[PDB]
Write an enzyme that holds these catalytic residues in place. Structure first.
Site, PDB file in Angstrom:
ATOM      1  N   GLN A 181      -1.416  -6.634   6.294  1.00 19.58           N
ATOM      2  CA  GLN A 181      -0.060  -6.083   6.480  1.00 19.58           C
ATOM      3  C   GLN A 181       0.401  -5.370   5.184  1.00 19.58           C
ATOM      4  OE1 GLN A 181       3.281  -8.772   7.143  1.00 19.58           O
ATOM      5  NE2 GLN A 181       4.184  -7.346   8.621  1.00 19.58           N
ATOM      6  N   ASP A 215      -1.381  -2.009   4.852  1.00 17.41           N
ATOM      7  CA  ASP A 215      -0.744  -1.122   5.877  1.00 17.41           C
ATOM      8  C   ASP A 215       0.628  -0.582   5.412  1.00 17.41           C
ATOM      9  OD1 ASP A 215       1.329  -0.766   8.131  1.00 17.41           O
ATOM     10  OD2 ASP A 215      -0.569  -0.833   9.282  1.00 17.41           O
ATOM     11  N   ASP A 268       1.485  -0.112   2.396  1.00 13.99           N
ATOM     12  CA  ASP A 268       1.182   0.842   1.310  1.00 13.99           C
ATOM     13  C   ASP A 268       0.876   2.216   1.905  1.00 13.99           C
ATOM     14  OD1 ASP A 268      -0.347   2.340  -1.020  1.00 13.99           O
ATOM     15  OD2 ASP A 268       0.152   0.404  -1.933  1.00 13.99           O
ATOM     16  N   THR A 324       3.464   7.090   0.722  1.00 16.30           N
ATOM     17  CA  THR A 324       2.371   7.866   0.195  1.00 16.30           C
ATOM     18  C   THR A 324       1.044   7.416   0.806  1.00 16.30           C
ATOM     19  OG1 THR A 324       1.757   6.482  -1.669  1.00 16.30           O
ATOM     20  CG2 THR A 324       3.585   7.942  -2.042  1.00 16.30           C
ATOM     21  N   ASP A 365      -1.907   2.806  -3.636  1.00 12.47           N
ATOM     22  CA  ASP A 365      -1.410   3.089  -4.958  1.00 12.47           C
ATOM     23  C   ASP A 365      -0.259   2.157  -5.304  1.00 12.47           C
ATOM     24  OD1 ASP A 365       0.562   3.930  -3.366  1.00 12.47           O
ATOM     25  OD2 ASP A 365       0.563   6.055  -3.960  1.00 12.47           O
ATOM     26  N   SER A 390       2.464   1.766  -3.666  1.00 12.16           N
ATOM     27  CA  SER A 390       3.751   2.384  -3.292  1.00 12.16           C
ATOM     28  C   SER A 390       4.684   1.402  -2.578  1.00 12.16           C
ATOM     29  CB  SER A 390       3.526   3.633  -2.475  1.00 12.16           C
ATOM     30  OG  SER A 390       2.703   3.416  -1.309  1.00 12.16           O
ATOM     31  N   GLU A 401      10.389  -8.638   6.360  1.00 13.98           N
ATOM     32  CA  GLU A 401      10.300  -8.699   7.785  1.00 13.98           C
ATOM     33  C   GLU A 401       9.840 -10.104   8.207  1.00 13.98           C
ATOM     34  OE1 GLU A 401       7.141  -8.542   9.663  1.00 13.98           O
ATOM     35  OE2 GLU A 401       8.252  -8.760  11.580  1.00 13.98           O
ATOM     36  N   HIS A 432      -1.921  -7.347  14.513  1.00 12.58           N
ATOM     37  CA  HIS A 432      -1.009  -8.054  15.372  1.00 12.58           C
ATOM     38  C   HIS A 432      -1.724  -9.205  16.115  1.00 12.58           C
ATOM     39  CE1 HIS A 432       1.912  -4.377  15.166  1.00 12.58           C
ATOM     40  NE2 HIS A 432       1.871  -5.063  14.005  1.00 12.58           N
TER      41      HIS A 432
HETATM   42  C1  HEM Z   1       4.389 -11.682  11.341  1.00 10.16           C
HETATM   43  C2  HEM Z   1       3.489 -10.524  11.130  1.00 10.16           C
HETATM   44  C3  HEM Z   1       3.893  -9.163  11.517  1.00 10.16           C
HETATM   45  C4  HEM Z   1       5.140  -8.726  12.105  1.00 10.16           C
HETATM   46  C5  HEM Z   1       6.396  -9.471  12.418  1.00 10.16           C
HETATM   47  C6  HEM Z   1       4.880  -7.294  12.248  1.00 10.16           C
HETATM   48  C7  HEM Z   1       5.894  -6.415  12.849  1.00 10.16           C
HETATM   49  C8  HEM Z   1       5.812  -4.975  13.003  1.00 10.16           C
HETATM   50  C9  HEM Z   1       6.980  -4.221  13.527  1.00 10.16           C
HETATM   51  C10 HEM Z   1       8.324  -4.648  14.034  1.00 10.16           C
HETATM   52  C11 HEM Z   1       6.501  -2.849  13.472  1.00 10.16           C
HETATM   53  C12 HEM Z   1       7.264  -1.616  13.914  1.00 10.16           C
HETATM   54  C13 HEM Z   1       6.831  -1.386  15.399  1.00 10.16           C
HETATM   55  C14 HEM Z   1       7.292  -0.058  16.025  1.00 10.16           C
HETATM   56  O1  HEM Z   1       8.497   0.137  16.211  1.00 10.16           O
HETATM   57  O2  HEM Z   1       6.478   0.820  16.409  1.00 10.16           O
HETATM   58  C15 HEM Z   1       5.133  -3.018  12.892  1.00 10.16           C
HETATM   59  C16 HEM Z   1       4.317  -1.882  12.645  1.00 10.16           C
HETATM   60  C17 HEM Z   1       2.988  -1.872  12.049  1.00 10.16           C
HETATM   61  N1  HEM Z   1       2.289  -2.956  11.738  1.00 10.16           N
HETATM   62 FE1  HEM Z   1       2.903  -4.925  11.920  1.00 10.16          FE
HETATM   63  N2  HEM Z   1       3.655  -6.885  11.903  1.00 10.16           N
HETATM   64  C18 HEM Z   1       3.035  -7.974  11.482  1.00 10.16           C
HETATM   65  C19 HEM Z   1       1.655  -7.976  10.989  1.00 10.16           C
HETATM   66  C20 HEM Z   1       0.774  -6.812  10.782  1.00 10.16           C
HETATM   67  C21 HEM Z   1      -0.549  -7.001  10.191  1.00 10.16           C
HETATM   68  C22 HEM Z   1      -1.193  -8.330   9.852  1.00 10.16           C
HETATM   69  C23 HEM Z   1      -1.020  -5.626  10.137  1.00 10.16           C
HETATM   70  C24 HEM Z   1      -2.318  -5.091   9.733  1.00 10.16           C
HETATM   71  C25 HEM Z   1      -3.364  -6.001   9.233  1.00 10.16           C
HETATM   72  C26 HEM Z   1       0.097  -4.822  10.698  1.00 10.16           C
HETATM   73  C27 HEM Z   1       0.036  -3.370  10.783  1.00 10.16           C
HETATM   74  C28 HEM Z   1       1.146  -2.508  11.203  1.00 10.16           C
HETATM   75  C29 HEM Z   1       0.997  -1.053  11.226  1.00 10.16           C
HETATM   76  C30 HEM Z   1      -0.141  -0.201  10.799  1.00 10.16           C
HETATM   77  C31 HEM Z   1       2.285  -0.605  11.774  1.00 10.16           C
HETATM   78  C32 HEM Z   1       2.745   0.786  11.976  1.00 10.16           C
HETATM   79  C33 HEM Z   1       3.476   1.148  10.649  1.00 10.16           C
HETATM   80  C34 HEM Z   1       3.947   2.605  10.679  1.00 10.16           C
HETATM   81  O3  HEM Z   1       5.075   2.779  11.183  1.00 10.16           O
HETATM   82  O4  HEM Z   1       3.228   3.564  10.220  1.00 10.16           O
HETATM   83  N3  HEM Z   1       1.160  -5.527  11.000  1.00 10.16           N
HETATM   84  N4  HEM Z   1       4.733  -4.242  12.648  1.00 10.16           N
HETATM   85 CA   LIG Z   2       0.739   4.485  -0.746  1.00 11.59          CA
END
Ligand code: HEM
Ligand SMILES: [Ca+2]
Ligand SMILES: *[C@@H]1O[C@H](CO)[C@@H](O[C@@H]2O[C@H](CO)[C@@H](O)[C@H](O)[C@H]2NC(C)=O)[C@H](O)[C@H]1NC(C)=O
Ligand SMILES: *[C@@H]1O[C@H](CO)[C@@H](O)[C@H](O)[C@H]1NC(C)=O
Ligand SMILES: *[C@@H]1O[C@H](CO)[C@@H](O)[C@H](O)[C@H]1NC(C)=O
Ligand SMILES: *[C@@H]1O[C@H](CO)[C@@H](O)[C@H](O)[C@H]1NC(C)=O
EC number: 1.11.1.7
Length: 595
Positions: free
Chosen positions: A105, A108, A110, A184, A188, A190, A258, A351
């Site tokens: 997370q 991600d 970053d 970014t 890095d 960020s 979060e 997720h």
């Molecule tokens: C309790 C753990 C976590 C919670 C509560 C959480 C919650 C969220 C929420 C609310 C979003 C925004 C969703 C949307 O409106 O589209 C999000 C996006 C994202 N999450 Fe998670 N997440 C968790 C763990 C993870 C983990 C472990 C990873 C990767 C190993 C991850 C990768 C991402 C990525 C790549 C996005 C899209 C970010 C962007 O907007 O570019 N998340 N997450």
């Molecule tokens: Ca960055």
């Protein structure tokens, strides 16, 4: 012909065409095309966008209009039928620690953030969306199907606002809608330091000229620093507990509180910044503030990159690692290092690795009190459990000694996320991150499962039996075909995550390709990559290669027992060593030889 015309919204600056260090914005990284990888630009498109109307309207928008001749299923229906499960027993990963999830997370946050179309506060549209579930403009609500228990309990829909997009955000240009990456594209740190000069300034402590970062005020961790509380209201970290009224932490990334383990990692990283600075001052008492800031920031960036590519990616990609991320041979200026739109879905594999509880542990790695283990949903936007319930050391031991959840084709996403998610604007723990993910895929104009399979040179199944063969799961293939009707129509998030994992890794072939490609690019196309000749010295690099997540812990907590390999499953005590076991970062190659 060709044009790089549209995209004026202006983080536009003058390029100090060498300078020692990264800008905050990531501008100037690439000399030829200096906007490449910078914050606040359009995510890159690896394949063209696929909207209902060619231009901007997501598949699912218009009832009448099919995808490939079939209705796309409601996101919440896919979430109910495929992603959900009841029983948490037996679902943990037997060779990944909870740190493995948490670090993913971090990495991600970053790399990518695509914030929603805000249209500010003081808005009737937010009422019109939530209150009435009326679709229009940027309100694209997630409708419950018939039979959904949330119908009885919650209303007609869960609210959802379309992501912001470049050029305008309100009225839109022509040519397909392109969503914004707010951070970014370079790896890095960020998320620690910020992706905007504005925030990057609030984060600095500009009183005392030791290049330090702003730390907390009211709160102290057994003599150690916390991040600063955030200014703004309303604050969700007060909303979850109005009696404790602890606000969220402030950090280089919006989403830092979060969940309590994300907060917890941000603390480790800040403490390490200050320890770097403080000691860089000792060696170089003649270095001024900025110089201490930028040299610390530079070391931390290396650390994030080293942990990631040396420890983390090997156990995600496993066997596919060296097929998609070959040995480094140096900086290629012709490499596009921007984060792709698709990567922002692929990296949501995370997720399915989030377990249903979090534990606090004591010095013996035994339960920290009567309420030691809590349900994940109580820990969304939760800063107070850190302040009142004994700091971060109890949580960090949980991160080391407890397990990730294992992706499972019959148990994909815990109900803590799939039914009890909390969203800041809204008042309930009643949302579905899986539904959101699927709706967001469509929001962003994602091509379907088969286009991505083709992109990565994998087979494109067209029947029930082809899908069964790819997924290696008859019942799953069958449920997928019943909802979507053609594998062409399967959303990339669920499509990618449904594949069985590659040997020694934690994602299937498509994901390993999408992920592997993207990480390759951000390493290769980064002029400030820690191994590019002249970024650090020979002696500096040798010192950096000694860093470990276990060393970071030792130095930034009151824990004296850590494992040598923090991301795999590590049982207390067989796998744990004394902190004196662990190699320490030798900063003596950062002594300046001015003279
Ligand atoms: C309790 C753990 C976590 C919670 C509560 C959480 C919650 C969220 C929420 C609310 C979003 C925004 C969703 C949307 O409106 O589209 C999000 C996006 C994202 N999450 Fe998670 N997440 C968790 C763990 C993870 C983990 C472990 C990873 C990767 C190993 C991850 C990768 C991402 C990525 C790549 C996005 C899209 C970010 C962007 O907007 O570019 N998340 N997450
Ligand atoms: Ca960055
Ligand atoms: C910035 O760092 C300085 C230096 O450590 C801190 O300044 C201190 O502020 C507290 C407030 O009572 C006192 O210890 C002194 O006024 C200062 N100490 C020193 C050593 O100069 C300050 O706390 C930091 N600022 C923030 C926002 O964290
Ligand atoms: C766990 O993963 C590590 C990664 O280094 C690997 O070397 C080891 O064989 C694995 N341990 C078990 C118990 O499979
Ligand atoms: C709120 O925090 C207080 C301590 O400030 C605690 O006693 C109470 O149980 C908490 N309640 C919730 C719902 O988190
Ligand atoms: C950098 O990458 C491009 C495209 O991937 C490749 O064609 C080129 O040969 C590489 N540059 C150098 C200097 O090898």
């Amino acid at each position: 012909s060709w044009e790089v015309g549209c995209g004026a919204p202006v983080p536009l600056v003058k390029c100090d065409e060498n300078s020692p260090y990264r800008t905050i914005t990531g501008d100037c990284n690439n000399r030829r095309s200096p906007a490449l990888g910078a914050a606040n630009r359009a995510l890159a498109r690896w394949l063209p966008a696929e909207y209902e109307d060619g231009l901007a309207l997501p598949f699912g928008w218009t009832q009448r209009k099919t995808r490939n001749g079939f209705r796309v299923p409601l996101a919440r229906e896919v979430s109910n039928k495929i992603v959900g499960y009841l029983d948490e027993e037996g679902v943990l990963d037997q060779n990944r620690s909870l740190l493995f999830m948490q670090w993913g997370q971090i990495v991600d946050h970053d790399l990518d953030f695509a914030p929603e179309t805000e249209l500010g506060s003081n808005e009737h549209s937010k009422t019109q969306c939530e209150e009435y579930c009326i679709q229009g403009d940027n309100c694209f609500p997630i409708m419950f199907p018939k039979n959904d228990p949330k119908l009885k309990t919650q209303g007609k829909c869960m609210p959802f606002f379309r992501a912001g997009f470049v050029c305008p955000t309100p009225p839109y240009q022509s040519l397909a809608r392109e969503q914004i990456n707010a951070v970014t594209s370079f790896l890095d740190a960020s998320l620690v330091y910020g992706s905007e000069p504005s925030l990057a300034s609030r984060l600095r402590n500009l009183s005392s000229p030791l290049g330090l970062m702003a730390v907390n005020q009211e709160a102290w961790d057994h003599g150690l620093a916390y991040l600063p509380f955030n200014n703004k209201k309303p604050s969700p970290c007060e909303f979850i507990n109005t009696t404790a009224r602890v606000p969220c932490f402030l950090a280089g990334d919006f989403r830092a509180s979060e969940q309590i383990l994300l907060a917890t990692a941000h603390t480790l990283l800040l403490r390490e910044h200050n320890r770097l600075a403080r000691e860089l001052k000792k060696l170089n008492p003649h270095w001024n503030g900025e110089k201490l800031y930028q040299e610390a920031r530079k070391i931390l960036g290396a650390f994030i990159q080293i942990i990631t590519f040396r420890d983390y990616l090997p156990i995600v990609l496993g066997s596919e690692m060296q097929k998609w991320i070959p040995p480094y041979q140096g900086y290629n200026n012709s490499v596009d290092p921007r984060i792709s739109n698709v990567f922002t879905f692929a990296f949501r594999f995370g997720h399915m690795e989030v377990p249903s509880t979090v534990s606090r542990l004591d010095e013996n790695y035994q339960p920290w009190g009567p309420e030691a283990e809590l349900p994940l949903h109580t820990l969304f936007f939760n800063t107070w459990r850190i302040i009142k319930d004994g700091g971060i050391d109890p949580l960090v031991r949980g991160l080391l000694a407890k397990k990730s959840k294992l992706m499972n084709q019959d148990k994909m996403v815990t109900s803590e996320l799939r039914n009890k998610l909390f969203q800041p604007t809204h008042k309930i723990h009643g949302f579905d991150l899986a539904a959101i993910n699927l709706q967001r895929c469509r929001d962003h104009g994602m091509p379907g499962y088969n286009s991505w399979r083709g992109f990565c040179g994998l087979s494109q199944p067209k029947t029930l039996k082809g899908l069964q063969t790819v997924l290696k799961n008859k019942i799953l293939a069958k449920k997928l075909m019943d909802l979507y009707k053609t594998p062409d129509n399967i959303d990339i998030w669920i499509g990618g995550n449904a594949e069985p994992m590659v040997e020694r890794g934690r994602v299937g072939p498509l994901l390993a390709c999408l992920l592997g490609r993207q990480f390759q690019q951000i390493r290769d196309g980064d002029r400030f990559w820690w191994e590019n000749p002249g970024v650090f010295t020979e002696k500096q690099r040798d010192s950096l290669q000694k860093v470990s997540f276990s060393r970071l812990i030792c130095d930034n907590t009151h824990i004296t027992k850590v494992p040598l390999h923090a991301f795999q499953a590590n049982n207390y005590p067989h796998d744990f060593v004394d902190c004196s076991t662990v190699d320490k970062l030798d900063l003596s190659p950062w002594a300046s030889r001015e003279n």
